[PDB]
Amino acid sequence: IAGFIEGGWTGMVDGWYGYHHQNEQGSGYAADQKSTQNAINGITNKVNSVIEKMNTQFTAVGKEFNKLERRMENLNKKVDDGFIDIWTYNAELLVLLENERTLDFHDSNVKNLYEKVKSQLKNNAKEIGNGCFEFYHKCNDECMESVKNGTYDYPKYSEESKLNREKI
Amino acid sequence: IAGFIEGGWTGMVDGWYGYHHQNEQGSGYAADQKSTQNAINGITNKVNSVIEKMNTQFTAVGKEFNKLERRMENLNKKVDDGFIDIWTYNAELLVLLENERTLDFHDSNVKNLYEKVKSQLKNNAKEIGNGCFEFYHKCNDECMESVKNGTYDYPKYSEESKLNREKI
């Protein structure tokens, strides 16, 4: 993505998509393992489908004609040049379109992770805008691990976050 | 979809996308008719464009050569094998990409229906997470039919839902 999350991370080396928590116990660059392995499986399937679908038989594309058979030579040249033109155009267009699709795929993965986190933190956190969420309660390492895991219990912190939200 | 709505429905046989209301009068698996016929029209157009764009002339792809014309035979074999390779690669890649596009199309239809329902129920209902909305008022069959229709009047139930929302 390059929209509401305008900066990539260099200190997160585990996975493609992940988290970053600031806490009274310390900061860190965690990774979201499920999304990055799903993306890796998808990209592996994409590359293998692009490469392995090309099954070719044994052929020799070179022919020799004498000086009284130039219609044959030009027909063979037309066949070869037409095949080269078709393959070149198709390969270039395919690569361009698939690069666009792959970048959109990564965009969708990042956005889906963002909405997945946002759904759990209904109003116990506030969006800041860069891609970040500031809690109204004290999210310790257990709470942060729950948020990254997907089992964040809203009712446990609901009133503690509500009083902070209404304070300001 | 397989994200925030993780389960399909077997008891809804009318359309591809639809609703399910729990009420004091009874439950049921309604269908959203406009979206499912729009999807059916789209898929019909897609399949007909894939199939009917192939216009072929009368041809015989078999030739016979004697034992002194093997350059001709190998040129014809090269033509046939190149055409088969091009068509096989293009057909397989096209089928894969269009299957991805169709699944994304159905995903977009479901999500668009979800946001369409969410916009009408501004804060008269609360999202539960599975794909569902719990009202703060009593939505009878008339109200449910209005919600499925698209003419849900927010101000009519606004204060009745507001007092319930602020109660808890």
Added chain:
Amino acid sequence: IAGFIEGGWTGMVDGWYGYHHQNEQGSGYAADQKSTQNAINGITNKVNSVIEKMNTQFTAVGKEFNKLERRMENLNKKVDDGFIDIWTYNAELLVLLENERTLDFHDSNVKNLYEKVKSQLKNNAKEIGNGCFEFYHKCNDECMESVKNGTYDYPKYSEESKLNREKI
């Protein structure tokens, strides 16, 4: 788009996407310049990639055969018809798919602009549904220019909009 923003604008001649503000000082059809130039660059790249990737060599696709070389004539006819079939099918399918992609691209641009405006106006404005936002404060020409520019300061109008929000 044709969903929650169901009507196009004829009075905005500057760009493809833009704004329309109603104010005590006057109405107008402004344009979002960054989005429309990004879209123009994208469409220019798309058209130039579709057109300019076709590099063709000097060829003459016409041959002449006598009445004792009809196998050669039918082989040449098969080559020509196969090339025409491949190019016709590929061109028609490509045009259809890229038209779908371009319309989705414009839809995504409009939706991204909508969410970009919505993020700045957290709760200082309320969504109306047609695609519009009604402020809880007095947004003069300076404020409107800030909203369109991207530097809308929420805390400046936060309490003035909050009292209006809680009034109704």
Added chain:
Amino acid sequence: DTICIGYHANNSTDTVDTVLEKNVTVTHSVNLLEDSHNGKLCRLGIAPLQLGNCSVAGWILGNPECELLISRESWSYIVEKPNPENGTCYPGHFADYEELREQLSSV
């Protein structure tokens, strides 16, 4: 306390071309085009026929100065010098020579 959503960035400077943009910096990229060779005539299932200084016309006719390489059994293809100096020692025309070269290219 905050938790932020982000994505991976590294120190690579690989560039790729999409359909809406050119020269995009990417984290990784795979080459679908093979642009290199090992410079050696490998085996295509079997070993190719190696004629050296001779041509097909001189080999099949039994050139007197080509008697060394007449022991090879079945092969996969023929390797010939770009301009074989030792072909038909006696000048003449080889009828259907390009057809014979196609017949004998793999036995």
Added chain:
Amino acid sequence: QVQLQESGPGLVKPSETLSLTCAVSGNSISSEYYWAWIRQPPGMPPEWVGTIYHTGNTYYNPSLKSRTTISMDTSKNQFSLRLRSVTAADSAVYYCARAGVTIFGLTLPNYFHHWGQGTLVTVSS
């Protein structure tokens, strides 16, 4: 195929209004493009004064916005500039130009593609 011609008084007394008129031939100024006034002081860079759209929409330079007014004649091809409260700093060459380029059916006001001739306005007595 577009020809623009300016006309106005070359001498203007201080603290009095300043009227210029540009007439266009080969084009309709209430139909398609945008029409702008650009001034240039002696030995300085050009300065955009204002622009009027074919829809009657006017956008002025913020520094000159208070005392400028660009009007159109929907009878014959003419657009006029009325710069009020003129001081010695207004003595400059004035140009009328056509802004707008059409790409993908969209006309963008980015640049001035055709210019007038330039009338020199001197503020003296």
Added chain:
Amino acid sequence: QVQLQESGPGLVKPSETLSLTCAVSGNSISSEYYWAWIRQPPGMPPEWVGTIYHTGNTYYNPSLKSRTTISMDTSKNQFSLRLRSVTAADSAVYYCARAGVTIFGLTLPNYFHHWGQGTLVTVSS
């Protein structure tokens, strides 16, 4: 092309700290991969103890996190384990391994691809 060698005392008295050191050759341990300690009690399955990243990030086994500490030497290729409060249950074979596999330019810590040799630590007096 990566060689790991462990070194430490084979006999450790109870209730005293326990220091081991793994030295690496053919690779730089402050640059690329992750480096872990794995222990195996006699007649039991292997147990992961901890891991240190090439960026200096340490992740420990939750059961042994309180008494464990993994350090790195950014001068020569060495990483050390300091397991405190050692009882008789700590008598086991200890291994140093390299975790990390590179696919699509991304290094994942999933598995241990190269192992050390294994030093047996006996807790007896």
Added chain:
Amino acid sequence: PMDECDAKCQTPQGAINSSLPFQNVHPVTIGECPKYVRSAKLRMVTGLRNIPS
């Protein structure tokens, strides 16, 4: 020079590892070879956008 190496395709300058679908080494090949194209590079992106701070 002829070597005892094994290959699937063969270009008059040297064999090709036929693991990729396309090649631009030479038009005239022999054996099951990738498809010749007139492109200088065909990079397919597998990672995401590189935007370091």
Added chain:
Amino acid sequence: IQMTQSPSTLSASVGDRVTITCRASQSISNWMAWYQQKPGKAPKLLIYKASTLESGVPSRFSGGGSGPEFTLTISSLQPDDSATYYCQQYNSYMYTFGQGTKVEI
């Protein structure tokens, strides 16, 4: 996270097609790893990502499965296969090993 590997013990003659099954408590990964530890030596990874073969590993070893269940299969057994086989999974920041499966001729 709990990892269960079956059968605990196994005896099979040379040439038998053997299969070991590993089950994971949580299916957040489609991936599992297989190690072969001979007595007195360190483990040696054979399969990773639940299907990929490590370099230098004989081809008869193979892996399959997904979700909650994965399988390691040896087609043509050899006399040097007598060892303990372990299934391992890295889930979030924890590596969990499964109990071994002894193999005897």
Added chain:
Amino acid sequence: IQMTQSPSTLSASVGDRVTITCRASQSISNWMAWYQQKPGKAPKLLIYKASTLESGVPSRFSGGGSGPEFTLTISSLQPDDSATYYCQQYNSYMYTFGQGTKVEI
């Protein structure tokens, strides 16, 4: 919005490959325009959209760059190139011109 053009003054012989650099305060456009004004005459647009050549303009003029920095390049200079060159940008509803660059043989 502030626009800086360098060098302010410049002399070069015929055939020199000359280059003028323009920098914009805000990079909300990838586009810039180049005008060539000769003394006593109105400006004449040469480059627009930061790369596009105006009709009737000699091919030796070229434009490049993006973001914050753009460049105008003349390959084979001519004796009629003595003029003042301006860089201009339209951002929101404002046209900003950069200070000129005089060119002399």
Added chain:
Amino acid sequence: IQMTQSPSTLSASVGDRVTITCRASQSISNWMAWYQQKPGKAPKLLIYKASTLESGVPSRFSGGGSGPEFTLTISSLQPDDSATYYCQQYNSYMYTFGQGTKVEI
């Protein structure tokens, strides 16, 4: 939902190209159905989905239109076409029939 079918009565000689127009109050479907009821008998569906021909129906019947307006066209009329033609639409959970049109030779 209100459905209006026009014209109510029709007389036409054999071979005439006749056209019947049906209009729906709400355009939530692009689909309409056509029935041909002969006296004393049950209706027989001819067109569904506003364009599709039912099996066993002669090809001369055709349907077209969308949104609010749909048309049924008979190209080569036959003496057995004397019947009442109905346009029907299913919108949400309701089937609405339009008033018939009588066709006479």
